[PDB]
Amino acid sequence: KTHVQLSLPVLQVRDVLVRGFGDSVEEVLSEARQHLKDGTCGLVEVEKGVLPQLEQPYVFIKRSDAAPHGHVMVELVAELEGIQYGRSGETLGVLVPHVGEIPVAYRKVLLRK
């Protein structure tokens, strides 16, 4: 299917145990898309101070559409050393591995694969 429906845990920065998906722009996006599938993506909402506390490269989800059945459509946009690779809407969050952290909310997104 071109877009999957998911809802990801919103995890507070300081709890996140694995703080970025890898060490290139191709592999933070490979794992993002590979963790969205296996069920293990959570979400940190970028607020002042969050990004320095996470590792680059950063996978944001951002909105690609001005809400099927509740879920915001969104796409991934790596960033590393200021350059973004992709082009999308507003950031609904940064994407981390979820590995037992206890969420503070969920965020119904629909991810273009």
Tag the structure with descriptive keywords.
monomer; 113 residues; mainly beta; SH3 type barrels; seven-stranded mixed sheet; 1 helix; 7 strands; 12% helix; globular; Host translation inhibitor nsp1
Can you walk me through this structure?
The protein has a single domain, classed as SH3 type barrels. It has one helix at residues 25-38, and strands at residues 3-9, 41-44, 58-63, 72-80, 83-85, 91-97, 106-112. Strands 1, 2, 3, 4, 5, 6 and 7 form a seven-stranded mixed β-sheet that branches. It has 113 residues and is mainly beta. It contains one helix and seven strands; from the N terminus they run E-H-E-E-E-E-E-E. 12% of the residues lie in helices and 38% in strands. Residues 1-113 are annotated as: Disordered. It comes from Severe acute respiratory syndrome coronavirus 2 (2019-nCoV). Residues 2-113 form the CoV Nsp1 globular domain.
